Structure 1
């Protein structure tokens, strides 16, 4: 009764919202937050695709996606803690000296 198209469009909306939140923010924490939004949107799209076909594979890919999201959130917050404890500044544009 629910269209697959509507669930896919909802996942796409959340994905592009996470992408623009990733781009527009100088603070690294909001960049990590936008990354979490994008990966949650991708997992939602996999759930919609799996539930449309009546298959278990969508929830399995969802489980793999949230395992990835947990590990990436852990690593990114470790890197953010390192940046804050070595520079006392979460500005990502200051971490830019390698260029050319």
Structure 2
């Protein structure tokens, strides 16, 4: 059930990754769930590049690039978090709607 049971867990993570995103209240939790979604897509990707495409790996390289960009985004978002917590002394996300 290798090729079949893992994909059955991709969605069962991806979905959760979205839900925690929407119902998130603090910035760090939203970023965590974002990273979780990216890892879900990564996992949905890799298995495809193990059943087939073994002559020239086309998924593992793409997985590497996805992880690199995930790290970059997780750096930039937290950097923005620093400045927002500097401006206002609380990072409650859903209590800032002064741009509407």
TM-score by structure 1 length? 0.89
Task: Tell me what 1:39 maps to.
Answer: 38
RMSD: 1.3
Helix, strand or coil for the counterpart of 1:93? helix
1:47-62 mapped onto 2 (5 Å cutoff): 47-55=46-54, 56-62=57-63
Task: Tell me what 1:30 maps to.
Answer: 29
Task: Tell me what 2:67 maps to.
Answer: 66
**How far is 1:51 from its partner?**
1.1
Helix, strand or coil for the counterpart of 1:37? helix
* Alpha-carbon displacement from aligned partner over 1:36-90 (angstroms, at most 9, x marks no partner): 0000111111101111214311111100110110011001111111111111111
**How far is 1:93 from its partner?**
1.5
**How far is 1:95 from its partner?**
2.4
Structure 2 residue ranges without an equivalent (≥5): none
Runs (4+) off by over 2 Å:
none
Task: Tell me what 1:98 maps to.
Answer: 99
Aligned length, in residue pairs: 98
Aligned equivalents of 1:61, 1:81: Cα separation in 2: 30
TM-score by structure 2 length? 0.89
Helix, strand or coil for the counterpart of 2:84? helix
